[PDB]
Amino acid sequence: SHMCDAFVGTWKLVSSENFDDYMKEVGVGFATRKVAGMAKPNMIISVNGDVITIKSESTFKNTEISFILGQEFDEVTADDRKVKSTITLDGGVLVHVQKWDGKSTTIKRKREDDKLVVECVMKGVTSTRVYERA
Numbered sequence: 001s002h003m004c005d006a007f008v009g010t011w012k013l014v015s016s017e018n019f020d021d022y023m024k025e026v027g028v029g030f031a032t033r034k035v036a037g038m039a040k041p042n043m044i045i046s047v048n049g050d051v052i053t054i055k056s057e058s059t060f061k062n063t064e065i066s067f068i069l070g071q072e073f074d075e076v077t078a079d080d081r082k083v084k085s086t087i088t089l090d091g092g093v094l095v096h097v098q099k100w101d102g103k104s105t106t107i108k109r110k111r112e113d114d115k116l117v118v119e120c121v122m123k124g125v126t127s128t129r130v131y132e133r134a
């Protein structure tokens, strides 16, 4: 057992709040927001040694990132930003910071009861997205 055990698995989106406004804050254009906001992604989290992989699959886009905690990587986000990302574990919360064009946004993933809760923040705009096991 180990570092991310309680996050590993296949998760499905069950609710979202304020995601359109979060995406507006990030700078996402109208048509991408509409199609992305309609998506119902499955998130697939796995661990092999020290390497964590997070996949997000939907009709909008399929993404995959692999990383080592605390070790920066370059990521092309689903909305086509080129960002410098670092993911760390802080008190049992996976904290994903993206840096680009002098801006920053943070995506936190938390296990709460039987759910996996995703909190996306930029400036004062937050979105909360709740996933359940698939």
Ligand SMILES: O=C(O)c1csc(COc2cccc3cc[nH]c23)n1
Pocket (backbone or CB within 6 Å): 023, 026, 028, 036, 041, 043, 056, 077, 078, 079, 107, 118, 120, 129
């Ligand atoms: O609920 C999630 O898993 C979740 C929330 S935010 C995230 C990764 O970032 C993004 C994904 C899709 C679209 C956009 C647009 C801006 N950022 C985006 N994944």
